[PDB]
Write a protein that binds this ligand. Structure first.
Ligand SMILES: C=C(Oc1cccc(C(=O)O)c1)C(=O)O
Ligand SMILES: C=C(Oc1cccc(C(=O)O)c1)C(=O)O
Lengths: 284, 287
């Protein structure tokens, strides 16, 4: 019987927003300490919650709904301070004409944020419905659409300009409304894994920080390589990678707090839900 | 419509025998040009053959059966010159007592299983009653007299379980070496013919990146084994020895081994004894 220690099962968002981080994990060799699963952010959240991953990214809403069972990594997240570029509202009309109009969404956090903004900032109540991210399809059936990930980035930088569609950056809309940054996803460990294997959890956290730091220093190398496989060019990817904000300190947490307070009672978690952070090792 | 170019779908054997290569693909950044799939060798061969992968490792037998539709990469393979350490026969009795005896064959293997049957029948002259089952040494040893394992399971049987329980472990790479004086090739890297023709430069760059990644894996083998030992029952010395015993060359001496093995097993495996192996031709230059 092979009772040797086993690698942590670590998830990783397949979209461009975490491609530089993947570059970091590969260049540092960190990937060989992981049992990696690449998928979409909503699937990776499902897996971690139900126990198919030990550590991985969790879209903020799904983290808040499971905050008692997850422990978030400090100093790394997927967020923005102003525009986020990859979370948008695409609209054929000004936003203030969406009351009673049809708005298409996406296959959990950004959708709630868009609904928060439209209802509580602009004061419109649209007839929402969910459909797969297809800007061309959405524009025929609805007045506006909510896209995330690469689709929103494509809508923002390519499709939007080509077809003369207003693209509203949800991160900028939030900033304008509150002056705050925004956090869309965090990294967490399952509580039970964090408690059974504290040092593995700790070193996974440190390896994510090291890989994230390397991804910032070599962002140009990442964008050059990635441009060969994307409709986006190297400049566009470099701008995207550098606009993304991967910090998770005090200003980001307060943004999480206030967002939770405004959407909690209508999303499925307490407005004052507590976010437990992986405590660093004390020394003597 | 996003008509941009897409990454090749590249397979990768999940066992330890290709972990240093994985270190190479990650450290070189090559991984970010692949859409990688990790699996067992028999699954990856099925996937490439049916079209779920563009490029990937193919266990030799399955490559030969599909030689018209696959183009093998030169100068990289999974092989040995002597012992391979991770392709073995585990037996409670001497091999010449296996005639009519029960022998289990691990499901994930196609080449090593055929090689073992070749050796037992044509070298030792025994005809055992084989059956296929998933790789579980503890289970195999209770129901059968001998077992054929590959990958990490065979590596564990050879280095750990065998000595602990006093089981004879026969290295299939050495048995072949003794019999023929030749090295052996268990798996090659190939591109689908249709993918190689539609995307010649991508195919070439994937090949070149595999060579560079393999070369880095040899130079930093100790770093790979040190890191890998933390997650395995094997220690760093054992893994380092394993990685350096594995032979990743695929030149002229390795091909003759492929040729001769094909000739001896072809008419009993499902391909002509003189099946042609098409290799990715290098680009000529003229300055
Ligand atoms: C940068 C992004 O921000 C995210 C990432 C993951 C999930 C969500 C969500 O809203 O659930 C948002 C992006 O999607 O590219
Ligand atoms: C070095 C090995 O040789 C192999 C590799 C891949 C497939 C097979 C097979 O038997 O099909 C054998 C190993 O398994 O570690």
């Amino acid at each position: 019987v092979d009772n040797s220690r086993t690698r942590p099962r670590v998830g990783h968002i397949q979209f461009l927003n975490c491609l530089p981080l993947y570059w970091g994990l590969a260049r540092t060799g960190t990937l060989l300490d992981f049992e990696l699963t690449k998928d979409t952010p909503e699937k990776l959240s499902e897996q971690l919650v139900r126990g198919d991953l030990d550590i991985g990214p969790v879209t903020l809403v799904e983290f808040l709904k499971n905050a008692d069972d997850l422990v978030a990594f400090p100093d790394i997240a997927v967020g923005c301070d102003g525009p986020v570029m990859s979370c948008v509202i695409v609209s054929q009309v000004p936003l203030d004409r969406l009351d009673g109009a049809r708005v298409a969404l996406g296959s959990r956090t950004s959708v709630r944020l868009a609904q928060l903004l439209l209802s509580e900032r602009f004061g419109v109540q649209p007839d929402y419905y969910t459909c797969p991210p297809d800007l061309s399809l959405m524009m025929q059936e609805a007045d506006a659409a909510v896209l995330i990930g690469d689709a929103a980035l494509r809508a923002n930088m390519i499709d939007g300009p080509r077809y003369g569609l207003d693209v509203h950056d949800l991160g900028a809309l939030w900033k304008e409304w509150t002056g705050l940054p925004f956090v869309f996803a965090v990294w967490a460990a399952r509580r039970d894994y964090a408690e059974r294997e504290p040092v593995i959890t700790r070193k996974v956290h440190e390896a994510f920080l090291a890989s994230r730091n390397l991804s910032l220093e070599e962002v140009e190398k990442v964008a050059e390589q990635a441009a060969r496989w994307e409709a986006f060019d190297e400049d566009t990817l470099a701008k995207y990678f550098t606009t993304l904000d991967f910090r998770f300190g005090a200003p980001q947490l307060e943004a999480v707090t206030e967002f939770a307070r405004r959407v909690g009672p209508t999303t499925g978690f307490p407005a004052d839900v507590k976010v437990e952070l992986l405590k660093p090792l004390e020394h003597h």
